[PDB]
Structure 1
Amino acid sequence: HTLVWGVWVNGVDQGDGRNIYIRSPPNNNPVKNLTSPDMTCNVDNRVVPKSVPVNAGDTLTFEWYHNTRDDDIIASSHHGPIAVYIAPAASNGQGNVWVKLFEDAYNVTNSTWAVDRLITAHGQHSVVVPHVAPGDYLFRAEIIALHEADSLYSQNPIRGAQFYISCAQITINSSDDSTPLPAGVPFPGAYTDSTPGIQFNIYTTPATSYVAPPPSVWSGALGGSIAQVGDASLE
């Protein structure tokens, strides 16, 4: 159970973005229905007044929270992967538009799921802004908690993979446009009950056998990472 407070740009806090540059839902309840319009940008998808200015090669850091900013972030039972997608604000989420810029599941060395590391990072994970056409974009961050993903929602409505999904409005000002944005996948639509990574037993199966949902990460991505970049408590 978790939501996004706002973003930092190159380590600089852009202030509370809720309902201002983030399309925030009314609360932190998960999304579970794979076919629902809520898979796009959660239950409350609508243009909000503002958009964060960035340039290609900026580091955009999303800050998640549970109840208050910089609290325990997400419950420690909610093991799973984290992903970030981009689409043009043009689409409004609809059609085959979403492109993956980041995926992180289980790191075998430290033996931590991406969600564990996000808790350590005080709710902060980042992506480098790719060299797409200047303009207005939605960045959709998704945490998949798998603590009940042994069943499917469509067969057992009280269980299933849980998606904590949030969309940020971002304006990309300076960019050479060396990597124009391709078409990508629809949400709802890219995740179905058959798709790998959706049904999985984190209690019986080992985390190394986990295989995150498709699609794979666009080659035009410049990466990202899970790690604190600023301190919220100095504010």
Structure 2
Amino acid sequence: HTLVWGVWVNGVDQGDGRNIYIRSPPNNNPVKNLTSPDMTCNVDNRVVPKSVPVNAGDTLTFEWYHNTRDDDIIASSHHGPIAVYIAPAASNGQGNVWVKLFEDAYNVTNSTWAVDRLITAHGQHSVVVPHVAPGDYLFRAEIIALHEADSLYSQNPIRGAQFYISCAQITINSSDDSTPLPAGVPFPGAYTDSTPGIQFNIYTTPATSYVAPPPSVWSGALGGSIAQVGDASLE
């Protein structure tokens, strides 16, 4: 159970984005229905009045929270992967438009899930803004909590993988458009019951054998990380 408070750009807090530049849902409940339009940008997908200005090569940091800013972030039970996608705003996230900029599942060295490291990072994970065409974009941050993903939601609606999905309105101003955005996947549509990483047993299957849902990270992606960039507590 987690939500996006706002974003930082190059380590500078852009301020509370809820219902302003984040298409916030009313609460931190998960999405579970893989076929639902809610898979696109969660249960209240509508244009919000601001879009955060960034340039290609900027660090865009999502900041997540549980109940209040910089709290426990997400229950430590919620082991799973984190991904960030991008699509042009003109799409409203419809069609084969979502391009993957970031994937993190299990780190074998530290023996930690992406979610474990997100808590340690005070809810902060980042992507570097790619050299796409200047214009308006949606950045879709996705946390998958796997603590009930031994079942499929489609088969048993009180279990299944849990999706924490947040769409940020991002305006890319300065960019040479040297890596134009390639073809995307649909949400809903890319994740199905057979997709690797949707149905998984974190209790019996070694985390080392976990494979995150495709698609793969775009070669044009400029980097990203799960790591605190800024101290919320100093504001």
SS in 1 for 2:232: coil
Q: Distance in 2 between matches of 1:174 and 1:222?
A: 15
SS in 1 for 2:131: coil
Q: Which digits, 9 at most, give the CA deviation of each residue in 1:77-136, with x for residues without a partner?
A: 000000000000010010010000000000000000000000000000000000000000
Q: Distance in 1 between matches of 2:231 and 2:62?
A: 13
Residue 64 (structure 1) shift? 0.1
Report the identity percentage: 100
Q: Distance in 2 between matches of 1:72 and 1:202?
A: 21
Q: Distance in 2 between matches of 1:111 and 1:192?
A: 28
Q: Distance in 1 between matches of 2:12 and 2:84?
A: 20
Q: Distance in 2 between matches of 1:75 and 1:212?
A: 20
Residue 223 (structure 1) shift? 1.3
Question: TM-score of the superposition, structure 2-length normalised?
Answer: 1.00
Write out aligned runs for 1:193-208 (5 A): 193-208=193-208
RMSD: 0.3
Structure 2 residues not aligned, in runs of 5+:
none
Q: Distance in 2 between matches of 1:80 and 1:192?
A: 17
Q: Which digits, 9 at most, give the CA deviation of each residue in 1:112-167, with x for residues without a partner?
A: 00000000000000000000000000000000000000000010110000000000
Q: Which digits, 9 at most, give the CA deviation of each residue in 1:145-202, with x for residues without a partner?
A: 0000000001011000000000000000000110000111000000000100000000
Q: Distance in 2 between matches of 1:86 and 1:144?
A: 17
Q: Which residue of structure 2 lines up, in the alignment, with residue 103 of structure 1?
A: 103
Q: Which residue of structure 1 lines up, in the alignment, with residue 56 of structure 2?
A: 56
Q: Which residue of structure 1 lines up, in the alignment, with residue 232 of structure 2?
A: 232
Structure 1 residues not aligned, in runs of 5+:
none
Q: Distance in 2 between matches of 1:54 and 1:157?
A: 40
SS in 1 for 2:119: helix
Q: Distance in 1 between matches of 2:177 and 2:88?
A: 14
Q: Which digits, 9 at most, give the CA deviation of each residue in 1:9-41, with x for residues without a partner?
A: 000000000000000000000000000000000
SS in 1 for 2:115: helix
Q: Distance in 2 between matches of 1:223 and 1:154?
A: 34
Q: Which residue of structure 2 lines up, in the alignment, with residue 86 of structure 1?
A: 86
SS in 2 for 1:20: coil
SS in 2 for 1:143: strand
SS in 2 for 1:15: strand
